[PDB]
């Protein structure tokens, strides 16, 4: 996946499970959840983005 | 085949419908219609003669061949002829309608079904005569049905 | 109200058929003038070619 990709979230406890989001930044380091995905729908706290791991995103559309 | 007779043509074909349904089935149906009509005209005139089949009763009563196919139906004689003709014609239905609009009609599209028992003549004059009398008896039996529905006797 | 109602039913049915077929999928505002060659009011009914 790359920055600007459209991904589908596979984390079951996430608010955006099986929902589409846009990759914002992939950090290159020791981070356990490096990929930053921004969503168009806020969750119950009202937070739009979240940090996700590389195996929790299923990918939909290339940049 | 058979052309006019003394000129050479495909006969009178003004409608030209020989290029619509295949000529093999046309020739087979022509021969079957004609042979049916030949037996029909002979049986008609023989019943009008007074000749009787070996099975007696109700056959001389329903004479003139017009109450024949209204009283022999209820007498049960007509059903036996229907089923015998039906079984032979369903053997023919197999051997003929297995091939139509397609796969070859290599049985001689006429009288090729058996029949090589007594004569073994196989004359071309016999074939030409067979088709000619076939259609002559078609018109003859049409006349014998229609004229005798109002006239009687020999006309 | 004086005329039979079946006459009206058949007339409205024929008009319904005519205008269902005169624009096969071109109902609604967003779908009719999608082609930039359909000028308004031109249903193609000009047999005499005026």
């Amino acid at each position: 996946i790359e920055r600007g990709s459209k991904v589908r979230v596979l984390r079951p406890e996430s608010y955006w499970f099986q929902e589409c989001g846009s990759v914002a930044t992939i950090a290159k380091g020791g981070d356990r959840y490096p990929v930053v995905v921004r969503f168009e729908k806020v969750n119950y706290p009202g937070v739009a983005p979240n940090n996700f791991a590389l195996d929790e995103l299923g990918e939909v559309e290339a940049p | 085949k058979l052309d006019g007779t003394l000129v050479g043509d495909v006969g009178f074909d003004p409608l030209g419908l020989s290029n619509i349904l295949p000529i093999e089935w046309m020739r087979e149906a022509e021969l079957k219609h004609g042979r049916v009509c030949m037996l029909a005209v002979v049986g008609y005139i023989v019943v009008d003669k007074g000749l009787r089949a070996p099975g007696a009763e109700k056959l001389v009563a329903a004479t003139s061949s017009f109450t024949a196919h209204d009283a022999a139906v209820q007498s049960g004689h007509m059903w036996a002829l229907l089923l015998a003709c039906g079984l032979f014609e369903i053997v023919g239905a197999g051997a003929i309608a297995s091939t139509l609009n397609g796969g070859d009609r290599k049985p001689g599209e006429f009288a090729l079904t058996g029949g090589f028992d007594r004569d073994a003549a196989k004359l071309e004059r016999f074939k030409l005569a067979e088709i000619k009398h076939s259609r002559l008896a078609m018109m003859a039996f049409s006349g014998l049905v229609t004229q005798d529905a109002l006239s009687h006797g020999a006309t | 109200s004086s005329t039979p109602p079946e006459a009206l039913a058949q007339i409205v049915l024929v008009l319904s058929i005519i205008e269902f077929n005169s624009n096969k999928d071109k109902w609604t505002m967003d779908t009719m003038f999608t082609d930039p060659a359909r000028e308004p009011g031109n249903l193609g009914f000009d047999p005499l070619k005026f």
């Binding site: - | 297995s98 139509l100 609009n101 397609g102 796969g103 | -």
Partner: protein, 188 residues
């Protein structure tokens, strides 16, 4: 799956207008206005076109047989009558009522046995998994039809057309005995 285009059964008289024709079938796709054969794409609950073809072939065959029975029972031609059994009810739809249980119970029994024993692969249909079965291919008259493609398809199209007409007719003789007038020229 088989996407309804190779299935024989399209009709020329639904392409009767200028444009479109053939031997007896319409060229641009068979008739399906409600797109009922495309309903397998959304949900597997809807049957495949193979199951629909088997259903209409069975309906058409039973309807030919039924309308022929209606045409023959309605005026004469009844089986000879013996003891404890009379085939005399010339009125259709009431003939099984005046009939002993050894006769009406034997038609249904043999129909059920023949239906159950020819039901091998109907549920391999509903999903397009033909392999065997091949819609209506019970075996009664296979290898009897022509071995080429055009004549066999013509024969099948003849079967489908006659069948559909019979369906519409047996349902015109019915719905007219129920309510008076669904067929103007009725005779029954």
């Amino acid at each position: 799956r088989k996407p309804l285009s190779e299935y024989v059964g399209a009709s020329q008289e639904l392409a009767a207008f200028p444009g479109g024709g053939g031997k007896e079938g319409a060229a641009p796709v068979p008739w399906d206005p409600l797109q009922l054969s495309e309903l397998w794409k959304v949900s597997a609950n809807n049957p495949d076109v193979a199951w629909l073809r088997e259903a209409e072939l069975k309906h058409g065959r039973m309807s030919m047989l039924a309308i022929t029975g209606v045409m023959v029972q309605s005026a004469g031609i009844h089986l000879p009558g013996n003891a404890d059994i009379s085939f005399a009810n010339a009125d259709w739809a009431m003939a099984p009522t005046t009939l002993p249980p050894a006769a009406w119970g034997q038609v249904l029994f043999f129909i059920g046995l023949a239906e159950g024993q020819t039901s091998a692969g109907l549920f391999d249909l509903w999903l397009g998994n033909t392999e065997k079965r091949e819609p209506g291919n019970l075996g009664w008259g296979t290898q009897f039809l022509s071995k080429d493609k055009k004549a066999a398809d013509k024969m099948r199209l003849k079967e489908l057309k006659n069948g559909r007409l019979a369906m519409l007719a047996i349902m015109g003789v019915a719905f007219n005995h129920v309510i008076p007038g669904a067929l103007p020229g009725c005779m029954y």
